[PDB]
Amino acid sequence: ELRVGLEESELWLRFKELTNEMIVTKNGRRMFPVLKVNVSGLDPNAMYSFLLDFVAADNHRWKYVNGEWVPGGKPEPQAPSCVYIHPDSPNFGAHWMKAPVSFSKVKLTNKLNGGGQIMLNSLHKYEPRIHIVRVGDPQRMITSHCFPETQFIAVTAYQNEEITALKIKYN
Numbered sequence: 001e002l003r004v005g006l007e008e009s010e011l012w013l014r015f016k017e018l019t020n021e022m023i024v025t026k027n028g029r030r031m032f033p034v035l036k037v038n039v040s041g042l043d044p045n046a047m048y049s050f051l052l053d054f055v056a057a058d059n060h061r062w063k064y065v066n067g068e069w070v071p072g073g074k075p076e077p078q079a080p081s082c083v084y085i086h087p088d089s090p091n092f093g094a095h096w097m098k099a100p101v102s103f104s105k106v107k108l109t110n111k112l113n114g115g116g117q118i119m120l121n122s123l124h125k126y127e128p129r130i131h132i133v134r135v136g137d138p139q140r141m142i143t144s145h146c147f148p149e150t151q152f153i154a155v156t157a158y159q160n161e162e163i164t165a166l167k168i169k170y171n
């Protein structure tokens with residue numbers, strides 16, 4: 001059976017209970033925590049690519065008021081559907097299963113200034129999603145995998161001082 005497990009789920013949950021935030025910048029910022037998954041039940045003999053995108057979580061934007069996140073407006077038009085290709089792609093099932101798959105180099109931006117960066121809208125909530133794409137497949141069989149534990153609001157600066165502190169503690 002194909003199984004994709006979130007690594008460091010307890011760490012992600014510490015951020016999620018505060019409401020997680022990720023900085024977006026013109027030139028793009030790496031994530032903390034980093035999304036990492038374990039994988040079993042691929043065909044070790046087959047080749048696959050791992051793609052990461054970010055799904056808009058809500059039909060409204062958010063704002064941090066009196067130390068609480070609350071609905072903050074109607075959403076902006078959706079960011080373009082940017083996909084990050086895991087740099088080990090394409091690779092054998094055996095490669096993906098031998099150790100956890102880390103998306104440590106993906107950068108989140110608020111400027112379409114290129115460079116395999118992911119464009120997000122500030123004060124919108126996103127859910128990371130991984131796709132496993134089988135290589136050489138005339139059916140183009142693909143799996144999708146959502147990580148609710150890893151939901152965050154994109155921000156140009158941290159709103160919650162507890163997030164700023166957690167980011168320093170664990171990073």
Ligand SMILES: O=C(O)COCc1ccccc1
Pocket residue numbers: 002041042043048132133134141142143
């Ligand atoms: O989904 C399965 O039963 C086989 O998993 C390997 C896989 C096949 C195609 C695309 C992604 C993963």
